[PDB]
């Protein structure tokens, strides 16, 4: 029977499931976020404080990779955690009517935001097309790093190139990227906190698209 | 973009507003009635509520007159209101002619009233549906007045979220002139078969009248019988 | 963006609202009538319904007066309403002149009424079309009053989802002065040919009048004849 | 975005609504009239229709009074309506002064009426145009009343989808004081030349009056002459 | 988005609707008048039209009273209407005081009327402009009433698509007390210089009055003189 | 896009405006009452405010009559207003019959009033909910009138942001005929359990009546008892 | 005859046809989805746990391919299954009128969603143009993998390149992609469940664009 | 004379001309569609079931080409057939007025759809720009196949490449494409059936932009 | 003097000038259109019926070029002819007012269409960006052919390539393009006929943006 199916779904993904995600965000998640922030924020100066030469393009700056990795993973997690909340709301979108949708919109704005979060959680190389705020590196940060770095290594390793800037360009990718890490983390914080706020302020409607005690006016 | 005013026809020639109120009525609990051998009866479902509510004031069935009574289905507000007009109209009718001669013009007065509100802007029709029944110079009577002023005399009909299913039944089971008690149960069955699986038809109110007699409301125990 | 108010002409100079109600009428079941040798007749299709409905109150044909009667097609609510005005107007006419002299001003009163509602905002026209027929100081009479107040006297015409097809017929088969029974069937044929393949013209009601005689409604058996 | 209410002027200072109704009139079949030697005449095109329609009730020409008559062009509903006002106004005028002295204030009453409806919201103007003609204390008379209340006295004019073409003619062919029969044909020609290639001017109705005589409607055979 | 209702001021504090009607007036053919030595005169352009139009009913100049008369410019419908009010108001004024003492309160009544319609929704102002002129207990009089109820007494002014150009002239050529015939031509010149290159000022109507005398309309031949 | 006018039904057949006012009532502080052994009582929460406010004018409980009284919940403006009608209606009732016979038609008058405002445009319903209680020819009485005109007689009920929680209680704890003092506390408990954690039920006003006795308002010290 | 043609179509694609699709989604489909999730979620760590060298670019990591394949196929199926429901609704779009379209919109929203599902079911390489949420790999996942991998192989195989990052870039594609697999699967779950919900809540209207018992108000 | 010209056009392209197209769609067309579906659906597994080596890049998998061809042609036909119905409606767009356009819109929606059909009938290589549902391969399927295949052949044939993925990439194009074939066919079915529905439901208005018996209200 | 200038323009480009264009379209133009259709429709099979080898990439298939040429020219002509009608309407756009523009719009829609015609008359290589129906080859068809063909010739001529698909790709361009020819011609037919219809239905308003017999209501 139908109604049971709907029920069966909403059950496995209850308010307390998504609510939990919100708590984990205000607690643990936020810490790690800033943790990677400080790691890169520092690993950054760790590079700005140095002069590059043929050697630095011979071995991949491990300390950096780790920083990027932690970032990648963090997003990864937040993403899934985000998806959770999505389903919670999505499996609760009432019948499509033209009135009484007062609640509904709540679910909408609450989603539309979720999107931005995960949207900015998921990577994307400078695509060069959208007019909006370019998406922070995100997930694919790790990849794009090596991609751009390898390029400069080839040119410098092999005979090798004599371009002095091509050298400083290497130095830049190392640093520029650690910057991009904190820049995205600083943003995620902002983003998350807002979501947390938004959810915690609408949950009652989020689950209850609309109340119905009709028995008092119709009979 | 048409369904906004009581006075605008659609391209098909429909009055979506008026319909929408026939929709408000469809949100009210089922109730039917049928005439038989000398008289008619009425049955109304009522999903028992707060024991803090004086049962006297929750009967979808009302005595307009001693020999006539009706039942509604829809917006409770509009419900009471119309009920009065019936009661009131009843009187005027009763005083200009010395007696409520034809139960018909009682229903006319009400139909004409309800109709009006579905033709002028600045107003909204009643989201109610009324089933009248009683005895007049002619005999057993049964009419059903809808939001738009439409009235039809039946031998058996109903209003409410059930109606269709209740008429679906009667429309293939009802057999006139049944002896009160028999007609009573038939309707009880008909009514029953309108609920949804799992639901248990609780105690529904019922009243009747018979040529030469005043109405009478079956008390919850005389009713608990056909359960 | 014009078809929203009864009072706004379109750039072509049309009143889409008024039209839309001529559209509501087109949703009502066909019905024609034609005069013949001393008198006229009327035929109305009726797709038999719930046997729980007292046949007395489902006749698209109504006796306004003994010597005059009409038939409608459209919103049932507006149907009843207009009908009364006819009946009512009939009387006033009958009392200020001692007798319903010209069946015409009975139809005028009704046309003028219906017309009004198609010129003022805050109101909406009647989604009904009436065909009047009877006997007056002049003789057989047949008029057809549309939603906008338009009246025309015929020798044969019709209203309803059929009309066109029914007039298409008569407009190339009708021959005046037929002896009642003959005119009766011709219309029966005409009416028939308006249905859709597969449909079987059920029992339609019919009534007539003849110079010096009151109307008469063919009973379902005298009708079952022309089947 | 201005052409929505009868009371809103455009930036140029136009009343598009009122105009749009002068547009509804332009959808009605042509009809002219002209005075001559002692009297005036009227001609109206009529594209013969269903033989089921009593010709008595399809004459765009109407006898308001014995000595005066008119013709309309536009919404049929508004047509009948206005016609009556004329007839009615005629009387009042006739009773307060003992006789319809100046055919003018008959046209005034009608113009003033029609005008009103083009200045208040909640209403819509008549989509009709009337041409009056007859004999008064002064003599031959011819006026043409448009939807906005505008009246002008002519020696010859017309209304309808033709008007322009019919006036284009008369405006370069008409010569006053023609002996009835002669003026009759001139107009016939004028009328003819308004149709579209291929069309054959069917039998149009015509009526006249002459100082000291009541009107008269040329019968279809006396008309079939100028064909 | 403000220019939609007669009752909404713009952010600058303007009533665009009222203005728009001063715009409808500007679409009407020019016409001026000026007082002189004992009396005033009026001149109106008229681009000769259909010879089928009885010249009696196309004179932008009207005799309200024997000693007073006016001219309009704008919507023809509203034109006639206002004219009457003037004529009518004239009378009442004339009967409560025994004589049209001050031509002023005749123009007041008209101004007050026109003004109203520019302050209430559900109505629309008159798209007409009237120039009054005549003789009262005081002497020569000339007022010009605009759509908004604004009235001003002149020695010379005009209305119509010309106005500006015609006043531009008089405002630098007019010299009071001219002997009728002289004032007549000056205005003729002024009027002339308002047309567009190529146009030939056709025969314009003219009327005058002089202390102790009734008005008089120059006949087309006495006019054909100043050509 | 429906929730904008008091006269437009939604596609489900709802009147969102009327509901929204049942929403304004839900913003008012809780208050219940229940009849018992010979008489009824009323309890109202009041979150003590500015000591600058004369306590006499902040009592959600009002003495309509000596033997009847009520309590409101919602827009304070509409609160006072309705209260008066009650008081006023009370009188008229009292003067045409010599005494306030049935407390019912006092509540009817108020219900009918409030109802009206939920069916005509140009108006807005009262955002108030009233609980009436007293003694009539019949005995203890308790009714609760909502914004839409809906009235029901109880044995115990409540209005305000609490209602649900307060009825949830009574609906599973209330036991009739309790001796005043006992019923008093039960309600006190019921009322208590409607607040939110942390909140301390301050001093709520209470009044009662008992067959043959006038009402009486428990003074803040006789109330400070059930704390 | 016309009417028969319309009928003939609606028949082969009945409610129970699309309804079935909904059941299969709440049951089997969902399992497999998560199944691939766990497979990649693991195959992922299976790579993160390793150091790359010239060898790994000599043979295509079969375990991965399988994971991708199962994903590809899964989408493929869900897609067709989706299409079914489309037709069911599409062959039931009432006459184009201007009123009474109350139902209709239901069909619309119910479709507009279906789209997103299948739209995110079907692959698409980082096109770099749209400003919305980049489409999860989807169908063409398999392809795009090899495409990006082969590239790095050439550069590393052939003499071969000395770029140390170019190496780690290889390692990344292997992992990065397994991530993208779960990332898309986690999403599909969310997506499906919503659809299921949405359909099960509107079907009555989905098939009945609008009810008509006109015989009671017109006659 | 003008009116004759208009007439002359509408005549050669009558209702029965476009109506015929609708019948051919519900009959023959649909069969062939699914026919190609099964052909590719199978030819697909026919490839998934195999391991690639230098040889498969030496000769173009004929069986595939045929499948693609049948697809190409099918679209081609449906396209023209579509165009027919277009003209039928287009030569019947009434005078441009501001009222009474009730019908008109019908013609519009009925066209707007036709578009989507043929739009999805006509090919288009992954352009990478539009945010909507990428257009199914369509017409230019055949081309784009060889184009992408040849590329991989060069790299593998010539010395030749050592990339093991570059090999499996070949394998992929062969299969991936047969997939794309059924994926587009499954869609066309959906699409067509809807069109058929839509036409058969509005034709009366499609040809009759608006009825006019004005003679009864004006005269 | 001004007014004369305006007059002088409208004169040289009268209704009968544009009307003529409409006639030539219903007559001659249409024939040629279909003529090229049959030419390519056939020249198409003429290629599908053949196997390619090093030779076919040594000489440019003349028969094709001619087909393309005739197409190019045809468009060229229809374009200018189109432009004519444009001017006719354009030199008759009334003063910019806010009311009475009833006509105007007519001119607008009548133009907006003209555009599509010529827009689809003028070529444009697969730009890969617009989301609408890709523009039929058109004018620049000829060019784009050689462009794409030459490319494949180089790769095959010079040593030469061994790619077997690269060969069939050549074969494809020859055919694929002849297809594109009929595909565009079939469309032009549709397009034109509509225009013809549209013009012939509105000309009265097209030239008369709005009638003015004001003398009857104002005076």
UniProtKB/Swiss-Prot annotation, chains B, C, D, E, F:
Keywords: Cytoplasm, Proteasome. The configuration of the closed gate contains an opening large enough to allow rapid entry of tetrapeptides but able to impede the entry of proteins and longer peptides. GO terms for cellular component: cytoplasm; proteasome core complex, alpha-subunit complex. The gene is psmA. NCBIfam families: arc_protsome_A, PRK03996.1. SMART domains: Proteasome_A_N. It is found in: Cytoplasm. Changing residue 60 to A: Prevents PAN to associate with the proteasome and stimulate gate opening. HAMAP family: Proteasome_A_A. The formation of the proteasomal ATPase PAN-20S proteasome complex, via the docking of the C-termini of PAN into the intersubunit pockets in the alpha-rings, triggers opening of the gate for substrate entry. Interconversion between the open-gate and close-gate conformations leads to a dynamic regulation of the 20S proteasome proteolysis activity. InterPro entries: Ntn_hydrolases_N, Proteasome_alpha, Proteasome_alpha-type, Proteasome_asu_arc, Proteasome_asu_N, Proteasome_sua/b. The N-terminus is blocked. The keyword Transmembrane does not apply. This is Proteasome subunit alpha. The 20S proteasome core is composed of 14 alpha and 14 beta subunits that assemble into four stacked heptameric rings, resulting in a barrel-shaped structure. The two inner rings, each composed of seven catalytic beta subunits, are sandwiched by two outer rings, each composed of seven alpha subunits. The catalytic chamber with the active sites is on the inside of the barrel. Has a gated structure, the ends of the cylinder being occluded by the N-termini of the alpha-subunits. Is capped at one or both ends by the proteasome regulatory ATPase, PAN. One of its GO terms (biological process) is ubiquitin-dependent protein catabolic process. One of its GO terms (molecular function) is threonine-type endopeptidase activity. The lineage of its organism: Archaea, Methanobacteriati, Thermoplasmatota, Thermoplasmata, Thermoplasmatales. Disulfide bonds: none annotated. Its main location: cytoplasm. Belongs to the peptidase T1A family. Component of the proteasome core, a large protease complex with broad specificity involved in protein degradation. The T.acidophilum proteasome is able to cleave oligopeptides after Tyr, Leu, Phe, and to a lesser extent after Glu and Arg. Thus, displays chymotrypsin-like activity and low level of caspase-like and trypsin-like activities.
